[PDB]
Amino acid sequence: FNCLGMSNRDFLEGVSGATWVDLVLEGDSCVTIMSKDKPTIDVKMMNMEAANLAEVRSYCYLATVSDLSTKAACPTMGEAHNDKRADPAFVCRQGVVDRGWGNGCGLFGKGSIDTCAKFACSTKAIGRTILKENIKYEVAIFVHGPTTVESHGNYSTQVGATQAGRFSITPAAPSYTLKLGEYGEVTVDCEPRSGIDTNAYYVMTVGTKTFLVHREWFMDLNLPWSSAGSTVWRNRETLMEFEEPHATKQSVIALGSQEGALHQALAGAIPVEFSSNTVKLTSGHLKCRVKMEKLQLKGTTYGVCSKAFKFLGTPADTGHGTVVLELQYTGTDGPCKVPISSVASLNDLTPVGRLVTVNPFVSVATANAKVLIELEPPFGDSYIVVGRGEQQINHHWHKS
Length: 400
Ligand SMILES: *[C@H]1O[C@H](CO[C@H]2O[C@@H](C)[C@@H](O)[C@@H](O)[C@@H]2O)[C@@H](O[C@H]2O[C@H](CO)[C@@H](O)[C@H](O)[C@H]2NC(C)=O)[C@H](O)[C@H]1NC(C)=O
What we know:
This protein has 400 residues and is mainly beta.
């Protein structure tokens, strides 16, 4: 929900004197944004899903091909009408059988025949739609306020500290104004627009493995089917019945169910994880405008920390041209600003390393508190320093 530690991170400084910034978020990526005299924040897209879906069709693979019927009609006696023709209880089909004396009929020749088999469904290869209106985005915003190696990744702690949030964006309401306590608030206006595949594709569901198929390959396929009712049409797939029998019994062999027909057209349609009501879309992006003239600093009326500061370990390389590290404050005094900067050479007057964790400070008054810090040092060798004079400590670093 925040950027630290992610490989898909991008640092931004909107514009000069800008209270807003235009941005682009995508799947597994994050973005850290900096702005003069204001907290740093991380905008990050968490999830992409198609919610509130609706079914469209339902092809079956089937069972019930058990009950039989064979309404017999003697030659010249006309056609045969099976009572099992009043209700879709069964599927009927007429035929004719060569007969006569040999089998109870008076004349010789073709006699009518109208048998019927039953139909209900077993495994429904269900499928649904994705209204562009069903697309909802989940953006998470973090605030680079006080943290520790520990609490930095705990969403809970952070929310509690009002230094994080997770809201959703929809075509309905593409914006939001996330309030962050005394830090004011950030208001994004993400524009659902994105470079992705049009809703044109259907939502194919097969047993467990969900897939995304082409409207037509799907709709224009050959298998029994049913929209939103218990009523099924084209059940003709109850085939291979017409052994072209006798009036006694017309073998109604249940058509062998060969999942190959489906499977075979696997690769074509893209696979997708789908929970009863959700469809996580993987490909997609979002253009946002992080307006933040309402984002504001905090603890700016406090004094500078004046007590020893100790490193808790070799700073680490984020792989982004910045490093992380955690301090510990011997200080007994309360919430004070942390005097840390990046100096080009011991005891220089002017800094050179910009802090990602701008305006850092010991959150509590409980001595020996920890402070996490991410900063970008200059290239080549440099020194990180905390405190000043004879309290001041330091640790060297060399960027490449
Ligand atoms: C963040 O959320 C929970 C907060 O507990 C922490 O609170 C801070 C202020 C500090 O005092 C920490 O020392 C303390 O642990 C914790 O998460 C809880 O739920 C997790 C569920 O997987 C579980 O792993 C964890 O043990 C449990 N801790 C508690 C409240 O007893 C945890 O600190 C951290 N959550 C995680 C694990 O990321």
